[PDB]
Symmetry: C3
Amino acid sequence: HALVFSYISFALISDKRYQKKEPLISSVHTKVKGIAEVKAEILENGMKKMVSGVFDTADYTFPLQGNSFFVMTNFIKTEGQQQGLCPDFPTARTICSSDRGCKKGRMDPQSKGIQTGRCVVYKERLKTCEVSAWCPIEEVKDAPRPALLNSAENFTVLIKNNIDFPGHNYTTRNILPGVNITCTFHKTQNPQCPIFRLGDIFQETGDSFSDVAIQGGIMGIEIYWDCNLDGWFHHCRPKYSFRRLDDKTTSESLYPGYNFRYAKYYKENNVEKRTLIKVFGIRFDILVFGTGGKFNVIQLAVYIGSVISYFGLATVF
Amino acid sequence: HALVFSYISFALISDKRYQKKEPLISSVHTKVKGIAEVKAEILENGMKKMVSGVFDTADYTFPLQGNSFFVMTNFIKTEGQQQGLCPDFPTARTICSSDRGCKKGRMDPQSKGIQTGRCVVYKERLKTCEVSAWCPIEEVKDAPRPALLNSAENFTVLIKNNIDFPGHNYTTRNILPGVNITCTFHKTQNPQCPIFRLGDIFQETGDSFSDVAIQGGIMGIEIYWDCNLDGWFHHCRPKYSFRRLDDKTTSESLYPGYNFRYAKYYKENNVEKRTLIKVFGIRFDILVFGTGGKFNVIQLAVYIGSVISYFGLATVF
Amino acid sequence: HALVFSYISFALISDKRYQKKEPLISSVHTKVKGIAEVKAEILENGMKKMVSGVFDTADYTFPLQGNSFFVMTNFIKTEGQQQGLCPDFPTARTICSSDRGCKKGRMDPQSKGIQTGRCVVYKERLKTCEVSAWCPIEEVKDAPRPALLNSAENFTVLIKNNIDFPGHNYTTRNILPGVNITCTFHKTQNPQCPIFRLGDIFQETGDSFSDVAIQGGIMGIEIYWDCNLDGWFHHCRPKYSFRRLDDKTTSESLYPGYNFRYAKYYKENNVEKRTLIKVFGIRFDILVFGTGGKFNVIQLAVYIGSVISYFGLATVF
Ligand SMILES: Cc1ccc(CN2CCNCC2)cc1NC(=O)CNc1ccc(F)c(F)c1
Ligand SMILES: Cc1ccc(CN2CCNCC2)cc1NC(=O)CNc1ccc(F)c(F)c1
Ligand SMILES: Cc1ccc(CN2CCNCC2)cc1NC(=O)CNc1ccc(F)c(F)c1
Ligand SMILES: *[C@@H]1O[C@H](CO)[C@@H](O)[C@H](O)[C@H]1NC(C)=O
Ligand SMILES: *[C@@H]1O[C@H](CO)[C@@H](O)[C@H](O)[C@H]1NC(C)=O
Ligand SMILES: *[C@@H]1O[C@H](CO)[C@@H](O)[C@H](O)[C@H]1NC(C)=O
Ligand SMILES: *[C@@H]1O[C@H](CO)[C@@H](O)[C@H](O)[C@H]1NC(C)=O
Ligand SMILES: *[C@@H]1O[C@H](CO)[C@@H](O)[C@H](O)[C@H]1NC(C)=O
Ligand SMILES: *[C@@H]1O[C@H](CO)[C@@H](O)[C@H](O)[C@H]1NC(C)=O
Ligand SMILES: *[C@@H]1O[C@H](CO)[C@@H](O)[C@H](O)[C@H]1NC(C)=O
Ligand SMILES: *[C@@H]1O[C@H](CO)[C@@H](O)[C@H](O)[C@H]1NC(C)=O
Ligand SMILES: *[C@@H]1O[C@H](CO)[C@@H](O)[C@H](O)[C@H]1NC(C)=O
């Protein structure tokens, strides 16, 4: 009976049911640092070409939108596209022996254009279905074998997180005043340090940064707040963890990795032209969750209300 | 009395109050497919002009930011704007009979410029208030009567959703391994299929895609997770539903539809110039909510605590 | 004993524990209005230059992404950058007396390039470490002393918020039909008016708009919904409040304010070139939280269950 008292009172103190919990409010602001020197040889349209240059912040990233930031790690670039009629790139689905294999007006999911219904030669005696689109069509090619921006492991993301509890009227931030900002977060050595290294993040979740960097991925940074708003035992600091949100399907149908197509439009010799750029990289999604607990009398009285009956019943035995 | 027992125990099992519920964590990744052939005749500056071309992914959409993606469906384009002094476009608010109707330095919400205080002729004998801005001012014109990108119904959005329950340590994803990816979601035939057709989405919520596509809108895709983390009766799959978030006010003051203005800057003959583009389209907002429930002894003991007293009182009658 | 009855029943009615509460679903759509005339004298590369022009929506803002919109308020612009070898900008960390102070291949966090290991003259007899990057390197300079877009206080943000409660199946919006849209929100005079003035927002939270506008900041607009879904006492309207999320650290290490670097790429004389633009401004983060309460019998029965025992114990005294 008395042990039932100590187990009830303990279950209260341990589950903090005397306290009232409120969901956290998060605001995220990120600043990425690091530059990458890129020298690589890429085969474009069957001809060897040299990609050289230095990439800084403006070249490979943009500001965080919606509690997430992206870092480009690789890219394929098709230049000089213009509105016109060209043979689709030779694939299992685009190759015609005769004009009959091509259907006029047909649109294919793999194709970036609308067929004209006429079989044409893409190169040599190989024939594909002529299409109307931005010409020439981007090659169905693989990403560069070493990620051009493979240096992105050494890049550094600084995270500033502000969390508010309205009902308890308690506002705090990720970074406290006076903390030594010159640190790299470590699971043990500097768990509070907001400075993060991307490669470190990938190792923590057990993934190689380079591999993901070749085709792209979606990493995830979790910030946990177990915040206790009582003056007796008070605590409210974040706990950083890392999880890979990327599906890692590795199936052509599921469109694996993270990549997107964006174009830059220009005019030349009184002709509208466009440079298509396939972009591969790791999107980092910041997930901040929390709970704020401050003692509430009504909740304690309701638990008391369950406990009184629990006690009578324990006495009955 | 005994029926009070079966109704209490039933109310427990039915409300699952033996279980503890935890809020879901959602990450969203989307890939849009489809291309649109656009041939239309648009009246620009009182002269007929022909808009022709093929639009692919890079031409009409950009990657999802903040659990939402946008698809352009129509656009008005004003080209060659440069810093200068020009008469405002003739409206009810911009027309002056004399230099006195124009106030120097005045800014109007409808106007894109600052008045110079001088009445000038916009065309013929019609006079408007001269303003300082990007010239010439975009016409106060309606969107193209058929949406140029009216084909966007036939476009296809693939959604990959990853949800995590930290406190229960349970991570799952929208798309399971081995599922037939070649499907279009149907309310009955393929409710689990993540492939979605935009026109289907509009029909489900009872709106015509074309109409919204002319002036823009905000559609909403709801993903519900009623996830039960007990091994006895286990279940954790999404339920897709569609709701129109757009306000549909249809009042000039409320700025109805979804549209925005963005510009491309270029130089010509040593003069800075800019192409303003009004963009209309449907923004799709993905809303994922969920609840994960796994049996908890303390919660069951608290409900027990309410129930014991409820029982004594039922015996009193 | 009876006062314990009135205090229990009161605690119920006051905490509404008869009701069941459900978390709110928010969708945000914003439209910004206002234009700014910018005339200012900026010292660029040690030479005086004149910035003049009119800025409209497309020039200083872009559409909301992830329940947040940004308004540029100031900017520094470095033009003509091209891939090459140039001396880093003279700072405490970049200045070399001899070729020995520079380490070949070294990358510094303050530097935007990779050192070649050779000491060179930046200007006159002052020597910095030669680096490989976009040349010339942007000056380590302060933002313009008056914010070029200092007029942004007078700018107007219109907010349309749609909130849904799925479990209660109740959908409502921020803006009701027939409301006088011609208003500016006031703490007292027009608390429901969704039209907001940015300067008003800064005064409400007790910050000067101009100061923040010089170096950038992150403002926050909170929308509270205390929604009661019972027909007896029904209410469901928003309560707007303003909080400054910006950390206001004012330390060079913490990267204070809100700013980002973005570039525009062009070709000249068969040379790839780039215009780097440092952008300063206030990001406004919209935070919508809410709770919907509709009477639930099971919850009332559980509270009853605590209360019956509470009553027996009160009788024991
Ligand atoms: C994509 C790219 C390719 C080549 C080069 C340098 N070249 C050209 C000059 N000479 C050296 C070699 C720079 C860039 N970077 C950009 O264009 C910036 N745009 C951007 C694209 C996607 C993003 F995700 C993002 F954040 C920002
Ligand atoms: C807006 C536009 C107008 C005309 C054309 C083709 N023209 C020009 C060549 N000849 C054929 C006719 C293409 C585009 N598309 C873009 O500029 C891409 N930019 C963009 C704009 C808003 C978006 F929402 C978005 F996702 C991406
Ligand atoms: C940055 C800037 C500098 C100067 C001028 C006008 N100049 C040039 C013509 N003559 C007058 C003086 C316009 C703009 N605005 C843009 O380039 C628009 N891009 C943009 C940049 C950041 C943003 F946050 C955003 F929302 C949009
Ligand atoms: C990252 O830095 C280390 C140490 O400077 C270097 O050894 C490594 O090669 C760098 N990573 C890449 C991809 O170059
Ligand atoms: C929150 O607490 C502070 C403590 O100083 C107080 O000044 C402030 O008024 C409180 N907030 C509200 C909304 O009352
Ligand atoms: C921060 O720590 C580093 C080494 O971890 C040290 O070199 C530096 O002086 C410290 N800064 C301060 C302000 O204590
Ligand atoms: C969508 O596809 C169907 C079938 O191919 C076609 O009949 C319809 O016209 C298409 N929609 C538009 C807007 O062209
Ligand atoms: C979550 O469960 C898995 C089950 O294998 C376990 O390996 C993992 O360590 C658990 N997570 C934590 C944080 O303990
Ligand atoms: C998927 O279903 C389609 C028809 O609905 C069928 O043609 C196709 O072969 C199926 N794929 C697999 C792998 O079963
Ligand atoms: C905002 O408008 C007021 C009234 O027109 C004006 O006095 C003030 O100077 C304006 N703000 C700026 C920064 O010009
Ligand atoms: C929500 O309530 C309305 C009331 O008219 C009803 O028509 C609708 O079917 C309800 N929603 C669901 C999912 O039943
Ligand atoms: C709205 O209020 C303003 C003044 O606050 C008034 O001038 C205007 O006529 C009102 N509009 C309507 C429709 O009542």
